[PDB]
Structure 1
């Protein structure tokens, strides 16, 4: 495509190697197009981003590239290549290339009903991927159907680590009604109560939500706003026990819970009468109110529902658990640009 190829009025400079573009979507420094990788003879997915004007966007870009490049797993999308100018001065945009995944669980569910065998396989892959992520001491933090890529062969890959953090269980407590950025419907109850979401159990809850969703094609706790989300959860799980309340020390959070009328638990087999009993048993253990009593990823994999797939020797863990040296977003966009430039250097044809 002549000098710089063009896509819907925007320059999509993916050089020679990648051709036959095609628009897919675009929300900010994020326009995605599928192209043809002349080198591997396969159409890929490419995302154009320009986060250098804003320090924040530089943080999510740096952080996610590092994670995604460090991670190597069959159930986590990998970066196949990264395009950028040869000089930091000339680098305005950055193109990241990933395998082309036709669809995702969000689109699948808004059209198809899944058999129990597909839900099982999908769940297996989700957890197989999460076990690796967690083994690297990283928390995804934004797991939801739209963040689970799927190809024509049922192959599932977790993507979107823009909100991922290095686990930090000790510094997880915060006040009641503390703002959160992760997608509302899949947020664990403790996030609206006292958690910063720096604990692994936060991802398991999201997976539990995805499970319920696969079972009924509808989001289980579709809260309209912050506190609505919580009443949605309590509506089905019912009022928290004394025990689980005695854990919540943040006085305000506990008093809020106590002020609420008593609500009984709604049986799962009632919510999902077509569901498989083993599935609903694992769902129960995932959607546990108390984070400390919530099942772990490895325990989930070893659950009877996933019996036909479970194979610990075939469920790899990270070789090098993560450590974010520039942890805590205190870096100017300048320094961040140098790090991104440096992090993407390995793909340079120079």
Structure 2
């Protein structure tokens, strides 16, 4: 066991191993708060997240377990992974707090085109990394569901990692089927998000900046066009088909004037209403737009992820015990 020290942060006592220094609050959420810190043991800037009352209820407890399981699973250059997880508790009986440590890359894509659009060469590099990481996540049978610029961290060398779990420092990037509570989501919900992000990097402007939910959907329909006959067959409701026909084309092509035609071709393949017809991450990696970076020998897939817990309805004490097990078994990365 490491030596811990105590300090008041974000309105509670944080108790952390001595290696983590210079904690500074950077965020809080309903479920946790984050400090930036410096890990004197590895020389890395890190984010330390202290969960807030991780076992307050069955739902909190399951969320805590899910977050830790997902972070422990992720071992890929373009996906955030778990550098450390700890608790000052010395037994399951004392176990009440959980702290998660991840890389702090130092910036994200959220600010990035406020001032000007990116070059085509730089968009190739960033989107390539997003898709390389998404191929990995998808191969584990995991769907991100909330890809957006603030969930894409980059360092000074513009190496990129996909984030989640409130490490991000809007519905503009959400697949329309998620907004329409469709359920039965495909992984290509995330490909829609990548298309929205890529479009914005190339043009310097949000692709679908809706003011509210229905506005978001109206903007999408204006740009990609009304559902064709094949997609209309997959929508049960006659009234819904009538209603979309009433809101429903602005040129997709006119949005991307001056762009690399290979970029536009890829955007057209990502931003397809019918999720069954969107390009996959793996397919996208092979598209000619990425010829400078694609290497099939180094676009690795994930170990399969045991998601049995997702469908379980367990008691708090069981979720808490399962979480404690995962804390104790953690082995830090190379």
TM-score, normalised with respect to structure 1: 0.86
Is the partner of 2:226 in helix, strand or coil?
coil
- Confirm whether residue 323 of structure 1 aligns to residue 306 of structure 2: yes
CA distance in 1, matches of 2:288, 2:184: 28
Contact 1:194 1:248 in 2 (8 A): no
Corresponding position of 1:115: 119
Shift of 1:252: 4.4
Contact 2:45 2:105 in 1 (8 A): no
- Confirm whether residue 65 of structure 1 aligns to residue 68 of structure 2: yes
Judge which range, 294-303 or 17-26, deviates more.
17-26
Corresponding position of 1:230: 217
1:266 to 244, 251, 276: 251
Corresponding position of 1:93: 97
CA distance in 1, matches of 2:4, 2:51: 22
Contact 2:4 2:18 in 1 (8 A): no
Corresponding position of 1:283: 267
Shift of 1:3: 5.1
CA distance in 1, matches of 2:82, 2:226: 44
Describe the superposition over 1:187-219 as per-residue Cα deviations: whole angstroms up to 9, x where unpaired: 222234462153112111111111112122332
Corresponding position of 2:294: 310
Corresponding position of 2:37: 35
Describe the superposition over 1:226-247 as per-residue Cα deviations: whole angstroms up to 9, x where unpaired: 3222111001112221222123
CA distance in 1, matches of 2:238, 2:319: 39
Corresponding position of 1:5: 7
Contact 1:208 1:287 in 2 (8 A): yes
Contact 1:136 1:317 in 2 (8 A): yes
Describe the superposition over 1:255-289 as per-residue Cα deviations: whole angstroms up to 9, x where unpaired: 3223x154x14133x11324221111111110001
Runs (4+) of structure 1 exceeding 4 A deviation are none
Describe the superposition over 1:294-324 as per-residue Cα deviations: whole angstroms up to 9, x where unpaired: 1111111111111111111110011x21231
Contact 1:239 1:265 in 2 (8 A): no
Aligned Cα root-mean-square deviation (Å): 2.3
Contact 1:59 1:329 in 2 (8 A): no
Q: Which runs of 5+ in 2 are unaligned?
A: none
Matches for 1:54-203 after TM superposition, within 5 Å = 54-84=57-87, 85-111=89-115, 113-160=117-164, 183-193=170-180, 195-196=182-183, 198-203=185-190
Corresponding position of 2:278: 294
CA distance in 2, matches of 1:56, 1:228: 32
Is the partner of 1:79 in helix, strand or coil?
coil
**Cα–Cα, structure 1 residues 88 and 2, in superposed 2: closer, same or farther, change >3 Å?**
closer
Contact 2:218 2:247 in 1 (8 A): no
Report how many residues are paired. Answer: 325
Is the partner of 1:101 in helix, strand or coil?
coil
Is the partner of 1:21 in helix, strand or coil?
strand
TM-score, normalised with respect to structure 2: 0.89
- Confirm whether residue 220 of structure 1 aligns to residue 207 of structure 2: yes
